[PDB]
Structure formats: structure tokens, C-alpha cells
């Protein structure tokens with residue numbers, strides 16, 4: 198039920214003390230469309246600027262944490 | 268000395284009054300390693 202329509206107290210809703218939660222579930226479901234588009238670290242940023250990219254190019258080898266600077 | 272030879276170079280008594288200013292140096296038992304996971 199719409200949060201906007203319940204503001205005037207003229208359609209179906211006079212007192213709705215949790216009307217400000219009405220669009221949380223729809224907004225959460227719509228955000229689930231990018232569940233697989235943004236999976237893992239590499240899909241949320243430019244990975245070559247992050248530390249894990251360096252470990253992969255070194256053959257999945259551990260590097261000192263400041264390797265991106267030297 | 269007393270029937271014994273201990274060969275040493277010529278001692279310099281001026282080395283006693285050598286101005287050696289103490290410098291700060293702190294040891295941290297528990298610090299940083301090389302690599303971390």
C-alpha cells in the first residue's frame with residue numbers, strides 16, 4: 198500500500214504509524230537485480246587499483262601490503 | 268707482566284674523554300611483520 202496515498206487520510210489509511218517502511222521491501226527487491234552484476238570485489242570498483250589484483254598477477258602469491266606504492 | 272706477555276697495540280689515553288652524546292632509540296617488543304594475510 199502506497200506511503201504517498203496514506204498521507205491525506207482520505208484513502209483506506211487514517212492511522213499508519215509504520216507507513217515509512219512501505220517502500221523498504223520494494224527497494225530491496227529492485228536492488229536484487231544487481232546481485233550478480235555486482236558480485237565480489239572486482240565488480241564494485243576498478244580492480245587494478247586494489248591490492249588483490251597484484252596478488253593475482255604475481256601468481257596468486259602473497260605480497261607486502263604496501264606493494265601498490267613501491 | 269708477571270712472566271706473561273699480552274701483546275696489545277699502543278693504548279691511547281685520550282680516548283677516555285670522547286664526547287659521545289646519547290641518542291634516542293626505543294625497542295618495541297611487539298611490532299610489525301613483513302607480510303600480512
Ligand SMILES: CCCCCCCCCCCCCCCCCC(=O)OC[C@H](COP(=O)([O-])OCC(O)COP(=O)([O-])OC[C@@H](COC(=O)CCCCCCCCCCCCCCCCC)OC(=O)CCCCCCCCCCCCCCCCC)OC(=O)CCCCCCCCCCCCCCCCC
Nearest residue numbers: 198199200201202203204216217218219220221222223224
Ligand atoms: C523530460 C522527460 C519527460 C517529462 C514529462 C513526462 C514525465 C511525467 C511524469 C511521468 C511519471 C513520473 C512518476 C512520478 C509522478 C507520478 C504521479 C503520481 O501520482 O504517482 C503516485 C504514485 C501512486 O502510488 P502507487 O502506484 O500505489 O505506488 C507507488 C510506488 O510503487 C511506491 O509508492 P510509495 O508511496 O510506497 O513510495 C514511498 C517512497 C517513494 O520514493 C521516493 O519518492 C524517494 C523519496 C526519498 C527522498 C525523501 C526526501 C525527504 C525530504 C528531504 C527534503 C530536502 C530534499 C533535498 C534534496 C537534495 C538532493 C541532493 O518514499 C518513501 O519511502 C518515504 C520514506 C522515506 C524514508 C525516510 C526519509 C525521511 C526521514 C529522514 C530525514 C533525514 C533528514 C532529517 C533532518 C533534515 C534537516 C532538518 O506514487 C508515486 O509516488 C509514484 C512514484 C514511483 C517512482 C516513479 C519513478 C519512475 C521513474 C522516473 C525516474 C525517477 C523520477 C523520480 C526521482 C525522484 C528523486 C529520487
Ligand SMILES: CCCCCCCCCCCCCCCCCC(=O)OC[C@H](COP(=O)([O-])OCC[N+](C)(C)C)OC(=O)CCCCCCCCCCCCCCCCC
Nearest residue numbers: 200201202203204205206207208210211212213214216217
Ligand atoms: C526551497 C524549499 C522550501 C520551499 C517552500 C516550502 C515548501 C514546504 C517544504 C517542502 C516540503 C516537501 C517535502 C514534503 C512533501 C509533503 C509531505 C506531506 O506530508 O504532505 C501531505 C499533505 C497532506 O495534507 P492534508 O491536510 O491534505 O492531509 C493531512 C491530514 N493530517 C495532517 C491529519 C494527516 O499535503 C501537502 O502537500 C501539505 C504541504 C503543502 C505545502 C505547500 C506550501 C505552499 C502553500 C501553497 C502556496 C500558497 C501561496 C498563497 C496562495 C494565495 C491564494 C491562491
